[PDB]
Design a protein around this ligand. Structure first.
Ligand code: NO2
Ligand code: NO2
Ligand code: NO2
Ligand code: CU
Ligand code: CU
Ligand code: CU
Ligand code: CU
Ligand code: CU
Ligand code: CU
Lengths: 334, 341, 334
């Protein structure tokens, strides 16, 4: 702790998921204080094609909050702002951090306040962060107040046996379970302010059964034309977080070649995975090299959650077909 | 390979057998890459899933739930002829999690009743993998009506432990675990329908609760119990492959262990050892290797014991041989006095 | 045979969770027959602050039953007693044991009976044990009749790269799902005898949705004055079991530095974990060295189960704050 005042500072401009801000895989030079700013927004979001609304409580105005990237032993310095236009106290708990409830006990900010938190990123991996105000923990989390950080090793990613792993592209999929109340007639209810939905929401939460499970804040957010892109031969890192509930991601037509299912880079990755499992409260990352072009779906493989409740994204991959890997010998025919 | 080199390879036609058994195969591959041929007919049919006579309209690969296990080796080609008979009412296809491209084959295999297709893929990654039907717009409904199975892609050189020692099994069984979602009437009695389509709306409503009414092995409560128990002998090394295409499960052999478990099902990831209960996420298959050391009845269960013993996910193994008192012995059998209660 | 008959015998007095009876990490001497005695108590317990009560079926009178510690290749010899004051037959199944349904087939005792089972502890790890009477297995387990045992390697714990891990303190957290029926008004029912609750309880169980998920038998049992304690610099092993349902433990403000999430010490541990996953029917263990003082919460990180249904514990850790790891650069302010 002597001295951090002396270390280089670097200010980062955050971008909206599923993209990730600029960063280098291998650390250029020594330890830094890496600086981020996020503003909290409470706002209504519409989550499906029926006009269903949630009162979201959103870091940077998005669900999930943006991905922050630092290197191991960097200091992450966060300016967190709760504008006066908000109604609730908020804070932040980084699972990457050591002490004071992951920073939660040091960052309680009422509307009109700000705070600056610094922590040392001592363990490499992807980690969830989320709001956790005393007495209202799960309600902020399942109103979308969560995201993830990645803490890369200084030397960048490696497989289990020291071989370097370099990605071309990285995408951040935040999965969210939402619990939207229904009236006597089975229609989703609307409210005029976040606090008004509280009691009705807690009733649904206690059933443990979400009404929607979505990627990047809405059904179809990452589909069709809002689809993640790649090319045949590109190496893609997919970071996936779920702050509350388990998930089992699967790339339909592909694999996880290397999967840190626990999200922790000092634990050697599983290989050749069809479906991996990320427990509620954790983030995980999978590395894949695309081999075939076309549309891939990326899903939570409880297929009711994926296809009925919203948990499905697309990858659109360009390139030439490889008939050795797969071919239609006889097309469907009568 | 080019198409020219592929047409040159030896071809092997396999006759599939119903689960929990597995067709004849070799552990270590004899020779180089082959084209292994399988045929499956899809059958939509009513199945009875409990002793109360509860029905579902199953959508079954080869007429069973789960569909049969197909066994190939790494870098073989699997060539499937898939037939959807004109007596079925729905379109079907197949998605192999083992395959690369076109939604695991689903985008190339859409067949209406009266059609057939032939797909070929290269099995480039060793492990056990789920396959399932996946028709656009109707994906979970086909899967939770039983339209799923698994394949095993063995390493050329057979299985090894984490330290490259060979692990040779004497018997293999395949347990496919299925969550069903059977609608209930006013009186809480299970509904019956004429055709699969008639059950659709009411089934989706149950599915959205995420709560199955039955969780069964081999298509029915008690299917692998009593005289249908799996069998082994003391000293025998058994591989149990287990799949769940939709929902998590946590298998456990009551009275035994998983000595080597590929809980993710993938043989390049080293197995976990000495497991009491292992976890297979929905959408995957896993495999456990065990050597029986004690005779008697064992139960093999999903260890959410409500799913095992109330909803149906329990099977038996009956194991022959001599008892080992060093491993366990009753020092004092239940005894005492007969008291009022 | 003679060999087995001549082994030394050690009687161990059990202690209630979350504490653990005295033992040595490294075995002192060669194999022994370790003797334990447990009496089964069926009794009414209060599980929340609303006075909800359940008829518990408790090994040694506690939920969970106590942790038994032996080392690999010791024999565990258990005397299990079903007092004449009880109403139901009970038995025991050790997942650590080989044969006769884990011992369940050899230990079926009516009230007024006792039995003694010996088994060889051949595999190292933490393992669940639970009651399992034929045809009523889940009902005894979710009435609290489960615990865990720990079979230490002879050489004590290691990180698998061979380095010794020596803990200063060990705590045992047993997590229990309860399924308490409600009447027409939504108020939890009370019953005269445990048999009276059976039909109503099985109906709740079939929903797969617990009414309460608690640590150490009640909401708040390990919070406030009953928090687990440690100091900065101490190494703590937390053994956690769940006999029926999955859990995802997380130390808020900390990590699992080494986690045997499967509970088996010949499988090398995961490292740097944020949240780990223990499937229903298993026990796991996490090893952590505290670095910061203060309150920590230890939770199931489905936060609805943690903060709404009861699955949250506290650690109170003494020592000096380390500003290098974390610091409030600017405290909450306008
Ligand atoms: O392979 N996706 O269900
Ligand atoms: O060990 N069977 O629950
Ligand atoms: O990090 N606590 O949820
Ligand atoms: Cu908040
Ligand atoms: Cu958290
Ligand atoms: Cu189908
Ligand atoms: Cu799939
Ligand atoms: Cu009992
Ligand atoms: Cu058990």
């Amino acid at each position: 702790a002597a001295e951090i005042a002396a270390l280089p500072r670097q200010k980062v401009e955050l971008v909206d998921p599923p993209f990730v801000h600029a960063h280098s895989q291998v650390a250029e030079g020594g330890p830094k204080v890496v600086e981020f700013t996020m503003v909290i927004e409470e706002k209504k979001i519409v989550i499906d094609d029926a006009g269903t609304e949630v009162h979201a409580m959103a870091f940077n105005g998005t669900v999930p909050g943006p991905l922050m990237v630092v290197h191991q032993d960097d200091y992450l310095e966060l300016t967190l702002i709760n504008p006066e236009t908000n109604t609730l106290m908020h804070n932040i708990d980084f699972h990457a951090a050591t002490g004071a409830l992951g920073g939660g006990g040091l960052t309680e900010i009422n509307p009109g306040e700000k705070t600056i938190l610094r922590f040392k990123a001592t363990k490499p991996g992807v980690f969830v962060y989320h709001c956790a105000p005393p007495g209202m923990v799960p309600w902020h989390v399942v109103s979308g107040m969560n995201g993830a950080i990645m803490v890369l090793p200084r030397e960048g990613l490696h497989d289990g046996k020291g071989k370097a792993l370099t990605y071309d592209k990285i995408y951040y999929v935040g999965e969210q379970d939402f619990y939207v109340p229904r009236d006597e007639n089975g229609k989703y209810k609307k409210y005029e302010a976040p606090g008004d939905a509280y009691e009705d929401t807690v009733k649904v939460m206690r059933t443990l059964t979400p009404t929607h499970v979505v990627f990047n804040g809405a059904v179809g957010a990452l589909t069709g034309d809002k689809a993640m892109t790649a090319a045949v031969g590109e190496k893609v890192l997919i970071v996936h977080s779920q702050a509350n509930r388990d998930t089992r991601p699967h790339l339909i037509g592909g694999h996880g070649d290397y999967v840190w299912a626990t999200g922790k880079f000092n634990t050697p990755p599983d290989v050749d995975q069809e479906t991996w499992f990320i427990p509620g409260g954790a983030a995980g990352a999978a590395f894949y090299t695309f081999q075939q072009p076309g549309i891939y779906a990326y899903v939570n493989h409880n297929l009711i959650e994926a296809f009925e409740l919203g948990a499905a994204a697309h990858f659109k991959v360009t390139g030439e077909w490889n008939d050795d890997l797969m071919t239609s010998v006889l097309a469907p025919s009568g």
